[PDB]
Structure formats: C-alpha cells, structure tokens
Design a binder for this molecule. Structure first.
Ligand SMILES: *[C@@H]1O[C@H](CO)[C@@H](O)[C@H](O)[C@H]1O[C@H]1C[C@](C)(N)[C@H](O)[C@H](C)O1
Length: 7
C-alpha cells in the first residue's frame, strides 16, 4: 500500500 512520488 502507501504511495509516493515526486511527479
Ligand atoms: C514522504 O514520505 C517520506 C518517507 O516516509 C517522509 O520522510 C516525508 O516526510 C514524506 O513527505 C511528507 C511531506 C510532503 C512531501 N509535503 C507530503 O505531504 C507528503 C505526502 O508527506
């Protein structure tokens, strides 16, 4: 799960 980036 979670997410992140940076785009
Ligand atoms: C993004 O995740 C890293 C790893 O857990 C943390 O060290 C970091 O503090 C975190 O960044 C925060 C601050 C930011 C970039 N303004 C965003 O709100 C993110 C989602 O959370």
């Amino acid at each position: 799960x979670x997410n992140x980036x940076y785009x």
